[PDB]
Amino acid sequence: STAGKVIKCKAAVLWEEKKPFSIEEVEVAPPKAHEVRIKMVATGICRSDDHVVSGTLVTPLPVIAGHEAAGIVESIGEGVTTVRPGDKVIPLFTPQCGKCRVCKHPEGNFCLKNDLSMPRGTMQDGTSRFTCRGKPIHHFLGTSTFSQYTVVDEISVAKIDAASPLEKVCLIGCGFSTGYGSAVKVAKVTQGSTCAVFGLGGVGLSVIMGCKAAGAARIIGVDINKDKFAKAKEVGATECVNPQDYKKPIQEVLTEMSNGGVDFSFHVIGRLDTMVTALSCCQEAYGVSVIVGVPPDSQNLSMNPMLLLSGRTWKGAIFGGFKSKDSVPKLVADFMAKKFALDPLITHVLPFEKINEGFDLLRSGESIRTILTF
Amino acid sequence: STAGKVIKCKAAVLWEEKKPFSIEEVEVAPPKAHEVRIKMVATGICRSDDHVVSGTLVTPLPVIAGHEAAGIVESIGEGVTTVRPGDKVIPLFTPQCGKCRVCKHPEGNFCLKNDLSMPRGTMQDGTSRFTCRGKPIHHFLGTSTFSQYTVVDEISVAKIDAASPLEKVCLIGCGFSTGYGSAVKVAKVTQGSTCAVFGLGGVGLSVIMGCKAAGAARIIGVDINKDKFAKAKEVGATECVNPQDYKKPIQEVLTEMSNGGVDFSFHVIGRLDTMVTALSCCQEAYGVSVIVGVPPDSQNLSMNPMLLLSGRTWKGAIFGGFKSKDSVPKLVADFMAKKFALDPLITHVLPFEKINEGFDLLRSGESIRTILTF
Ligand SMILES: CC(C)(COP(=O)(O)OP(=O)(O)OC[C@H]1O[C@@H](n2cnc3c(N)ncnc32)[C@H](O)[C@@H]1O)[C@@H](O)C(=O)NCCC(=O)NCCS
Ligand SMILES: CC(C)(COP(=O)(O)OP(=O)(O)OC[C@H]1O[C@@H](n2cnc3c(N)ncnc32)[C@H](O)[C@@H]1O)[C@@H](O)C(=O)NCCC(=O)NCCS
Ligand SMILES: [Zn+2]
Numbered sequence: 241s242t243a244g245k246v247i248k249c250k251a252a253v254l255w256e257e258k259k260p261f262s263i264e265e266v267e268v269a270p271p272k273a274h275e276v277r278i279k280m281v282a283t284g285i286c287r288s289d290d291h292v293v294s295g296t297l298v299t300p301l302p303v304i305a306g307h308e309a310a311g312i313v314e315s316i317g318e319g320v321t322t323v324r325p326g327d328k329v330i331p332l333f334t335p336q337c338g339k340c341r342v343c344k345h346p347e348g349n350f351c352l353k354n355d356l357s358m359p360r361g362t363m364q365d366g367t368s369r370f371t372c373r374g375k376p377i378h379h380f381l382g383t384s385t386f387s388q389y390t391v392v393d394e395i396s397v398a399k400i401d402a403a404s405p406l407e408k409v410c411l412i413g414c415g416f417s418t419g420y421g422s423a424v425k426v427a428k429v430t431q432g433s434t435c436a437v438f439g440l441g442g443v444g445l446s447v448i449m450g451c452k453a454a455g456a457a458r459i460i461g462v463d464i465n466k467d468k469f470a471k472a473k474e475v476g477a478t479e480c481v482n483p484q485d486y487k488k489p490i491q492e493v494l495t496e497m498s499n500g501g502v503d504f505s506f507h508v509i510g511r512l513d514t515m516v517t518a519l520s521c522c523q524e525a526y527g528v529s530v531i532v533g534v535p536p537d538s539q540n541l542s543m544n545p546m547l548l549l550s551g552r553t554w555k556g557a558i559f560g561g562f563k564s565k566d567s568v569p570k571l572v573a574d575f576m577a578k579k580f581a582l583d584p585l586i587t588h589v590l591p592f593e594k595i596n597e598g599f600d601l602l603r604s605g606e607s608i609r610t611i612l613t614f
Numbered sequence: 615s616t617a618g619k620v621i622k623c624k625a626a627v628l629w630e631e632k633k634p635f636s637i638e639e640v641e642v643a644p645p646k647a648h649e650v651r652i653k654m655v656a657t658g659i660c661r662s663d664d665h666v667v668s669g670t671l672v673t674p675l676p677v678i679a680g681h682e683a684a685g686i687v688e689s690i691g692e693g694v695t696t697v698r699p700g701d702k703v704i705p706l707f708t709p710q711c712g713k714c715r716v717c718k719h720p721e722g723n724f725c726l727k728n729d730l731s732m733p734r735g736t737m738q739d740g741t742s743r744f745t746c747r748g749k750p751i752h753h754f755l756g757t758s759t760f761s762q763y764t765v766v767d768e769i770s771v772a773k774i775d776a777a778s779p780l781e782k783v784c785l786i787g788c789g790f791s792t793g794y795g796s797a798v799k800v801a802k803v804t805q806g807s808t809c810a811v812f813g814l815g816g817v818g819l820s821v822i823m824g825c826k827a828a829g830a831a832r833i834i835g836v837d838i839n840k841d842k843f844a845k846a847k848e849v850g851a852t853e854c855v856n857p858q859d860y861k862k863p864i865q866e867v868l869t870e871m872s873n874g875g876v877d878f879s880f881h882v883i884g885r886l887d888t889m890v891t892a893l894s895c896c897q898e899a900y901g902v903s904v905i906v907g908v909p910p911d912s913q914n915l916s917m918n919p920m921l922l923l924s925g926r927t928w929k930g931a932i933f934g935g936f937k938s939k940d941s942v943p944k945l946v947a948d949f950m951a952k953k954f955a956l957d958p959l960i961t962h963v964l965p966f967e968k969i970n971e972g973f974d975l976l977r978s979g980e981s982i983r984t985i986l987t988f
């Protein structure tokens with residue numbers, strides 16, 4: 241019915257920074273060559289979406305935000321070969337073009353067609369598929385999932401198992417994969433190792449799941465909020481520490497606990513002043529520290545490079561280091577085989593039209609993840 | 615034979631900071647259990663030795679410095695099994711005890727018995743083998759090579775090829791191995807890659823040698839002293855750039871030269887304000903930057919963690935990442951098999967008693983390496 245025609249639907253438009261989302265009637269254009277229009281099924285609310293609201297993730301406004309989601313293909317443009325109408329799909333906020341120097345590299349995943357480094361808020365062709373009362377609305381990270389229908393470039397969508405429960409596997413689009421890959425792909429946590437995870441939100445919980453899957457002997461969760469500890473232990477933490485409970489700095493506490501430093505540390509907080517702590521607690525000769533979270537308006541930190549000169553490695557990644565289009569379908573197949581659970585991450589489910597309530601849950605710290613259902 | 619008896623010989627004692635070396639008659643005690651007394655044949659003058667003079671590498675004084683050297687075993691203490699009198703040896707400023715968690719780790723080489731982290735200036739047993747008119751003199755890094763005879767712990771000496779030229783292979787004791795391993799061991803430079811080397815002293819030249827050995831397609835030398843360029847190009851640099859020649863910051867120049875960043879970058883200068891440049895010039899998704907050189911009085915550097923979040927790796931090492939006792943003999947065997955050259959690193963040779971003239975050459979920037987011969 242709808243192929244080749246404009247669809248009128250509802251979307252959450254952000255007209256201006258520091259305002260609530262507005263549920264608007266929007267027009268969604270049909271897909272052009274190598275583009276895919278998706279009926280959204282479920283979308284998560286992630287911190288990066290809230291950073292758009294706060295104006296600390298700078299991207300052009302007005303905008304349809306949302307980047308962690310799952311849906312069903314409504315139609316495909318000319319030349320699309322990797323998905324068909326009816327297929328379940330996850331939009332990829334980190335694309336996989338397959339052609340740039342990063343996509344061709346065995347260890348790179350931050351494809352040069354991404355819209356995260358210098359956001360333009362468009363499709364790959366420099367235009368938008370959304371209007372509201374005639375006014376063009378920007379895309380966000382090539383995804384724009386806070387809409388009943390979106391249009392994405394082929395390089396920014398993966399086909400997934402037809403039997404997938406979309407209201408769970410949407411987390412594979414951002415938070416789960418970010419944390420899980422930080423452990424299994426970026427750090428390559430080893431069997432028998434000791435890990436420290438700084439921050440026990442949904443992404444840090446996913447980091448734990450990854451360390452556990454990799455066979456870590458010890459997984460030390462670190463959070464200032466002791467309410468986060470029970471879920472951390474449920475998904476794999478062997479122990480949890482609150483820096484506020486100790487009369488010395490937590491890097492010293494962790495180095496003592498680990499008999500001279502941990503094998504792997506992960507920084508999973510949108511804060512600067514915890515990053516050098518996380519680096520320093522790994523063993524000085526062979527420890528590895530991974531940066532997963534950063535504040536959005538990120539300033540410089542202060543550190544002593546002798547922390548690296550002894551043999552430490554410090555690295556980060558986007559999207560868990562996973563080549564996105566190769567990996568997302570594989571992560572879904574693993575979920576279907578019960579290799580990991582997503583239910584512990586999902587604290588709240590709301591209809592889409594309650595998007596503002598979902599953000600209020602995020603800002604208050606009450607949610608791990610809220611999933612919006614269309 | 616001198617075995618089992620005190621040796622009276624000459625050594626260069628540093629009595630106080632910021633003074634010339636004094637050539638003194640010293641008494642060298644015989645080796646105790648698990649110790650080895652070595653007749654020095656040649657010793658290099660390295661920047662770290664001069665930092666001892668400056669008072670910026672803190673180690674107890676008075677001291678016999680010197681850590682890059684080669685000699686012949688004069689005698690062995692009780693229980694020594696890995697060297698015999700008459701053997702050619704290189705003292706190891708980074709020990710290999712073989713027992714600590716680092717020695718046991720596949721990737722670690724900064725053995726916990728080292729005297730670099732918190733120098734005490736003694737033998738492993740907490741005592742000294744040196745006296746100068748009855749006054750005890752400190753050891754340096756468990757080596758003290760600025761003496762006609764020294765005593766070292768067995769975990770700080772390696773047996774090398776009986777046929778090796780000691781006046782060349784002494785470089786394997788610090789400068790050569792540091793730069794070469796930074797490339798082949800720490801960074802693991804790949805065939806066809808683009809490397810950037812910051813600092814074209816002896817260690818930066820050895821980095822270049824390692825990158826060439828690894829099959830790098832482009833090796834960009836960076837130095838503020840253009841007199842260092844010709845030798846850099848002799849040993850493998852494809853081009854050299856002087857930051858003083860450019861209006862833009864050199865990370866921008868190098869990113870443009872390399873069409874979006876280099877594969878590997880190396881920081882080989884005792885200065886802080888070049889380290890973030892070196893990290894930033896590597897490709898943002900898969901670039902690796904290695905810290906080889908640091909200033910001794912090292913303060914905190916300012917950096918933005920967003921440089922790592924895109925996928926860059928930042929790491930450092932001591933002694934090129936080589937497990938020292940395992941690797942030094944193999945490096946000497948490679949040299950004897952003509953797998954690399956050391957002559958390009960040796961710019962000056964002086965008799966030992968002209969040590970202060972050798973430090974003048976280092977301080978002025980005139981030398982790459984001076985070797986002292988006994
Ligand atoms: C932080 C990231 C990974 C989101 O993680 P997550 O959703 O788990 O964050 P969340 O705020 O819910 O959790 C953070 C946790 O840190 C804890 N925390 C806060 N301060 C501290 C502290 N001083 N010590 C320990 N824990 C702390 C909080 O109590 C909380 O439990 C994300 O926002 C981020 O920064 N990503 C960077 C990469 C990126 O921008 N990718 C683009 C797509 S999102
Ligand atoms: C710097 C190290 C590696 C010694 O290297 P090397 O002998 O090659 O040093 P050297 O001073 O000769 O050369 C440094 C070169 O940097 C160049 N340089 C100086 N400033 C700049 C600049 N702004 N940009 C580019 N090049 C510069 C100099 O002109 C010089 O050619 C060493 O001192 C060090 O810091 N090692 C750290 C590890 C350690 O302490 N190990 C213990 C045993 S040494
Ligand atoms: Zn790409």
Ligand SMILES: [Zn+2]
Nearest residue numbers: 286288414415
């Ligand atoms: Zn996200």
Ligand SMILES: [Zn+2]
Nearest residue numbers: 711714717725
């Ligand atoms: Zn050891």
Ligand SMILES: [Zn+2]
Nearest residue numbers: 660662788789
């Ligand atoms: Zn040295």
